[PDB]
Design a protein around this ligand. Structure first.
Ligand SMILES: [Zn+2]
Ligand SMILES: [Zn+2]
Ligand SMILES: [Zn+2]
Ligand SMILES: [Zn+2]
Lengths: 481, 481
């Protein structure tokens, strides 16, 4: 008594398992044809294109951006693809308890030893805009309540604004600042800073009309500790030492941590400038961004204005934070014609709000025709899932890939070579994640509402940039009874 | 190449599957002996004890409380067990994007048609206390950052406080008020209110020294809408109608929604009272709580003072929000000797922060010796998981139970009777959830740190209140390579 969705996937798994790990062939969709056209054009311009791509340097930057972004992170930074570790969600949020955010952060900081973290917002952000001008949005409204907290906490700055556009601009800027605060306040960044690890967190925004990054501030190292205001030196370390009953002694009245003060300063510097006309900072991030812009304007004086015209995306791409190729690029589409979600190991966990919010927004509101789950050969997140690391956020998130391994030993057992075996796990993970998006209330509602929505599974190796078909599902009822 | 944990569970599954659905026998632990002693004493006092329990009325209250609570919700409300749908987490949080919270809320509101929602905090809350006086706590500090936002937003009220205790009292009260705000602001409560559904949200606190509920305010129906301040009537409904590009027009400068005003009023009423000495309201909740208290004092004048002395809990109990029996009761222990986490269908999702935060706090900080995952026969959450409902929060959360069904068809296929079939799924769900807690970085660290930690699986039918063994694991390495 399996549902049609269940049957469909058993069929897709057989189709996958009949091809060897890493050798799946491209499929039917025009995305494979477009991906091919791209590969050809790339090889034609530079025959070393993929060799260089497959052999780039580790990323030194973690970039937390928005899903509706018309410019790839590496591009804005004038850096090679893959040199920037990317996380994307609705309105570039850095919610305190969001594990999708926390796991990408911990992976970037502890696994990758990333040196700089950038939170980037963009003017005109559909997420920020929905928070102010739309209601009764369902699931995603719960995600957007965090942006509402930003408007709430900063009413003084917002009410000051002269018009709707100036107010949206300012909310977007304040949103970035608030997320920067959140990144610095995580246990991950606090621990790193306590251990003297070199790690900066900086905010940035830009308008697609010029692609110019404006500065929201950089924090180098600021303790967010306030226990010094409530615990006597003797009672200090109480809870960790098993004593949760040690008294709270008000050492000082209204103490604020170093982080609080740091943010107070950055806020002051943001607010004193005109909304939407912030200055660029002097850090290399801005100078590199500037060289990039000039280079673009050279080859095309309207480059950015066109970028600012691109039509609503018809595809949602869910990929891995490793990202050695921008989604729009791999399928030969203009920057901004694809809505993107990226996390560690391209997971589509059933109950993951970051994933569900992007899905709903794309499927229900933007009405995209396709949802593509894209994995990649040699994925470090997947490789990390098989290791022995005990990191509280990243390693509990990765336990989901372990379930995939465990439930697919029949096929995995046949492969003993480590490389191929990882690559097979990576393929089945894509298949399993596709199943999950197909099973969401979101896709099921769209389907039985008669909405055209294709869920495509894809995988590729950076050495060739060729997309390999993991399966496609046009419609499949998931009802059992 | 399975890990020891994996082998261990294959062994536990065989042991379970050899007993018919609903007939598993009690196990070895003293908890089964204690549960039995309890059943006997109950039957001896009233032979209709379980018959009444098994046939109680559906809950009209949703109660969101804290995991370190020394008093069962139904007790404080002077109501029969099961008459209150309970959710418990660290510091009774109602985080905007917390799916564990959102799925219990939606189930209570849409499935159960609950009429009143109560957010209850308690003085001396270890979660609130840790937020002020302890740092470098790891995973859980990310959960606790939300309480820090409460201190941040309410600095004016807090700095006013004369001492540490008064300041903790006031933070706890403000925390409850902030969570009430969050409950009202959810898409779930906003939708219900828009549909004219009768649904109140009220805040309450109490100190275990008297068990007296104090009022934090009740909100009956307040729109949290602000799109009216930014969207012209024509542009209204833009995003839902597929147009995310409709302009944002600042209709009015600093508009606040009905909810904002409502909360401003409640805050004013809380703040003007002495921290820790709030008044009780006049609603039946308070009058019933009062009758309950007097009844307790009658049979025991020190009832509450003793309650306030109970030692740190030695067990973490993870149960279902249905809860027809308090955890401490079922295993014959004093109110407050068991740390409790409750969600829909007693889920222990790998990446669930609400679950992970309670786990870490109990295992790492309180150092509990046992973690018990308790499921129950005829569980409505599990039954709901097999239905066709498309609710954005509750139904995506339940997809996890669907995975259990799908991966255990070998055993499930043998059963055709709906009742037994559900009951078997419920059993395997407990086993699968135990596996998940065993596989967390938290339990693995404790184990290879040589810390005594037993993970017990248990299930029962309310018709007899007898705990049935689903398995126990004392230690099992989960490393593959
Ligand atoms: Zn955006
Ligand atoms: Zn990857
Ligand atoms: Zn507490
Ligand atoms: Zn239940």
């Amino acid at each position: 008594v399996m549902s049609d969705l269940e049957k469909k996937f058993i069929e897709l798994e057989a189709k996958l398992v009949a091809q060897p790990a890493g050798q799946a062939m491209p499929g039917k969709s025009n995305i494979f044809a477009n991906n091919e056209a791209w590969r050809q054009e790339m090889l034609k311009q530079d025959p070393e294109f993929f060799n260089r791509l497959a052999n780039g340097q580790s990323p030194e930057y973690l970039w937390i951006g928005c899903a509706d972004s018309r410019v790839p992170a590496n591009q804005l930074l004038d850096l090679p693809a893959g040199e920037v570790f990317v996380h994307r969600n609705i309105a570039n949020q850095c919610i305190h308890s969001d594990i999708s955010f926390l796991s990408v952060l911990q992976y970037a900081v502890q696994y990758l030893k990333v040196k700089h973290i950038l939170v980037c917002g963009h003017y005109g952000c559909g997420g920020a805009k929905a928070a102010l001008g739309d209601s009764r949005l369902g699931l995603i409204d719960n995600w957007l309540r965090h942006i509402r907290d930003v408007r709430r906490m900063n009413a003084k700055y917002l009410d000051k604004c002269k018009d709707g556009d100036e107010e949206l601009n300012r909310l977007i800027e304040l949103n970035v600042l608030e997320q920067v605060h959140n990144v610095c306040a995580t246990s991950i960044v606090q621990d790193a800073w306590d251990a003297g690890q070199e790690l900066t967190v900086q905010g940035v925004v830009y308008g697609v009309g010029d692609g110019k990054l404006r500065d929201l501030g950089v924090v180098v190292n600021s303790s967010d500790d306030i226990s010094k205001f409530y615990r006597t030196k003797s009672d200090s370390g109480a809870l960790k030492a098993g004593n949760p009953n040690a008294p709270l002694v008000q050492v000082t009245k209204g103490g604020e941590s170093e982080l609080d003060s740091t943010m107070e300063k950055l806020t002051a510097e943001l607010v004193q400038q005109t909304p939407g006309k912030l200055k660029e900072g002097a850090n290399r991030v801005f100078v590199n961004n500037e060289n990039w812009r000039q280079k673009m304007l050279k080859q095309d004086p309207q480059f950015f204005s066109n970028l600012a015209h691109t039509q609503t995306p018809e595809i949602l791409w869910i990929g891995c934070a490793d990202s050695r190729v921008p989604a729009n690029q791999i399928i030969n589409l203009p920057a901004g014609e694809v809505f993107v979600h990226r996390n560690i190991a391209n997971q589509c966990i059933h109950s993951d709000m970051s994933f569900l919010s992007v899905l709903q927004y794309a499927v229900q509101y933007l009405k995209v025709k396709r949802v593509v789950v894209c994995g990649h050969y040699a994925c470090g997140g997947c490789a990390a899932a098989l290791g022995d690391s005990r990191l509280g956020l990243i390693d509990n998130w990765l336990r989901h890939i372990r379930d995939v391994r465990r439930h697919n030993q029949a096929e995995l057992s046949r492969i003993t070579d480590p490389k191929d075996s990882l690559n097979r796990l990576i393929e089945i993970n894509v298949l399993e994640q596709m199943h999950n998006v197909c099973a969401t209330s979101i896709v099921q509602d769209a389907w039985d509402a008669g909405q055209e929505l294709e869920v495509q599974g894809v995988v590729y190796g950076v050495g060739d940039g060729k997309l390999r078909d993991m399966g496609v599902v046009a419609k499949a009822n998931d009802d059992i009874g």
